[PDB]
Design a protein around this ligand. Structure first.
Ligand code: HEM
Ligand code: HEM
Ligand code: HEM
Ligand code: HEM
Lengths: 146, 141, 141, 146
């Protein structure tokens, strides 16, 4: 991913305000609610029967933390997303067989969650920079398919 | 296909747009043109600059069309037939672009209506926009 | 959204299918499992070997469901409500898989009914299968 | 793209029966009829207003022949599709901005045309081999997006 220094600064500044403990769970939870077929990959996570059960599920919150951490790892090395996500790509593609459209969906759900949290601060240019990031992360996750 | 709960959620959430229709629709367009610059190809003679009055005016048209869709949510192909002819037959808009605008509309609603944009309403709005997109990308005359 | 002419094309084409509906359903499943091996994960306990009586039996069910859908092309959500709950709520099938089976059905029809599989009929059938797929991947109770 | 010896033999045997003057035009024509937004990329080709007009259009036929030629070349370079298709990828992605889902659609329309022409010869194992090929070609065309 090629961000201008201005775009990188904007993205980094906002991410510094993102709640490490909660935002990943909110994004993963909304993925499970908005695109219900994705629940099939999380049988062992317990109760996903209603939107409240999903968003309150401890394993969703916990797993969401890991997901956010991976996005954070991407942010830390934008010039080497493919390298950073190589192990995760093997897992999601070769082992789990997640259709790669779903990678795009989760990235876009994260963008919605950022907009929800930050309101007016999530300007169109800030969004545009994040869209480059989440597209890069999705492409890196899908690398074993390419 | 929308559930009864979906229709309830959409009517309630979109109902809060009101007089901000033009503003929110324009913001959604601006987000799309900036985040996904390939979409600009469909508007070759528009002023697409930040704060453009032309984008503002077009935002109002899009938002009002969505209001129309909500008011006819059980019978959308007949209500949107003119818009389907425009986007599918005349303009031949690639279906991917409707996913892009739909996402930017959700982002706009999330940024302006924090209390309304619950996970359940988010889900319903996404389905609604997908349904509208299917109508606008179909040729069914 | 299907046009009036689309509906006529689908009814005419599926009518020609007639008594081979079951055979073609089994072949489409076989094509899908072989061409897109990830789809087999939805049938972990199935005998999926060539000539499988279980796949043949399931192919007949799929074909009969399509025949029902063609009969109720104007009212597919109501007609397919049980099937939608099965695929969208219980089985949670990723929508990509419906594109894969739909393609394998078209391939099966093309191979068996080449005279019937004109460009216009191809177009109408693709739209019809997309419409069925949307109903089966929607939760609308 | 790796094919078993059995798959390679079967792919080659079927392709030898393809009418190289017609099949590409049939595939391209059906793309334009079945997925009508794709016509936007071919505004200069003249009459595309009816299925008969599309399928009988000389420019669709002529262009279709070029497309088929690219698939034919691909069959001889299955281990280096990203290299072979690099110039075409730059054209379709960077210049024309064709959304890559359309590459997948054209590949699957080609498969439908092969099924139409060869019926019982286009067995499910033969189809499976061809799906590997058209997926490889679509992926190589989309490479600039990855
Ligand atoms: C698109 C961005 C995504 C990122 C950054 C991401 C990140 C991660 C991470 C960090 C893990 C834990 C890896 C480990 O413990 O070794 C994981 C596991 C997993 N992911 Fe994702 N993921 C993404 C998309 C998805 C999607 C879209 C799905 C399904 C629809 C999915 C399904 C799973 C599953 C099933 C697991 C294993 C959970 C378990 O331990 O049972 N992932 N992912
Ligand atoms: C929910 C989705 C959409 C809605 C409700 C919508 C609605 C509308 C409306 C109401 C108009 C004006 C019609 C008139 O003047 O009579 C319009 C025009 C137009 N739309 Fe959309 N639209 C949608 C998606 C899109 C997308 C995704 C694109 C392309 C990226 C697009 C491209 C255009 C163009 C090019 C025009 C004509 C502009 C001009 O030359 O005047 N539309 N649309
Ligand atoms: C046009 C599309 C489809 C139609 C018409 C269809 C129809 C059917 C029918 C009639 C049944 C039997 C239900 C019953 O008698 O209880 C069934 C079951 C099932 N379908 Fe589909 N289906 C479609 C697409 C798919 C796809 C794309 C998948 C996954 C790749 C899928 C996975 C399944 C599974 C796993 C079962 C249950 C099998 C079992 O364990 O008994 N279906 N479907
Ligand atoms: C997926 C397999 C595809 C293959 C193998 C393929 C191959 C080709 C080839 C060989 C050319 C000629 C390049 C040249 O003259 O230098 C071409 C041009 C072109 N392609 Fe494709 N293509 C594919 C998909 C698509 C799709 C899906 C579209 C969507 C519309 C598209 C749009 C075009 C256009 C507009 C041109 C230029 C036509 C002109 O000269 O006016 N291609 N392609």
């Amino acid at each position: 991913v090629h961000l201008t220094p201005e775009e990188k600064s904007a993205v980094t500044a906002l991410w510094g305000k993102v709640n490490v403990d909660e935002v990943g769970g909110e994004a993963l939870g909304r993925l499970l609610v908005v695109y219900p077929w994705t629940q099939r990959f999380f049988e062992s996570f317990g109760d996903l029967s209603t939107p409240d059960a999903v968003m309150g599920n401890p394993k969703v919150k916990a797993h969401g933390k890991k997901v956010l951490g991976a996005f954070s790892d991407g942010l830390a090395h934008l010039d080497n997303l493919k390298g950073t996500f190589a192990t995760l790509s093997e897992l999601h593609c070769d082992k789990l067989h997640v259709d790669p459209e779903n990678f795009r969906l989760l990235g876009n759900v994260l963008v919605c969650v950022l907009a929800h949290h930050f309101g007016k601060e999530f300007t169109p240019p800030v969004q545009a920079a994040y869209q480059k990031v989440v597209a890069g992360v999705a492409n890196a996750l899908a690398h074993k398919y390419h | 296909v929308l559930s009864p709960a979906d229709k309830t959620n959409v009517k309630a959430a979109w109902g809060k747009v009101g007089a901000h229709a033009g503003e929110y629709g324009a913001e959604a367009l601006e987000r799309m043109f900036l985040s996904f610059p390939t979409t600009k190809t469909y508007f070759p003679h528009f002023d697409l600059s930040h704060g453009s009055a032309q984008v503002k005016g077009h935002g109002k048209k899009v938002a009002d069309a969505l209001t129309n869709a909500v008011a006819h949510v059980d019978d959308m192909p007949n209500a949107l037939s003119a818009l389907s002819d425009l986007h599918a037959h005349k303009l031949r808009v690639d279906p991917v672009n409707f996913k892009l605008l739909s996402h930017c509309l959700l982002v706009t609603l999330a940024a302006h209506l924090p209390a309304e944009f619950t996970p359940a309403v988010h889900a319903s709005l996404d389905k609604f926009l997908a349904s509208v997109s299917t109508v606008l990308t179909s040729k069914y005359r």
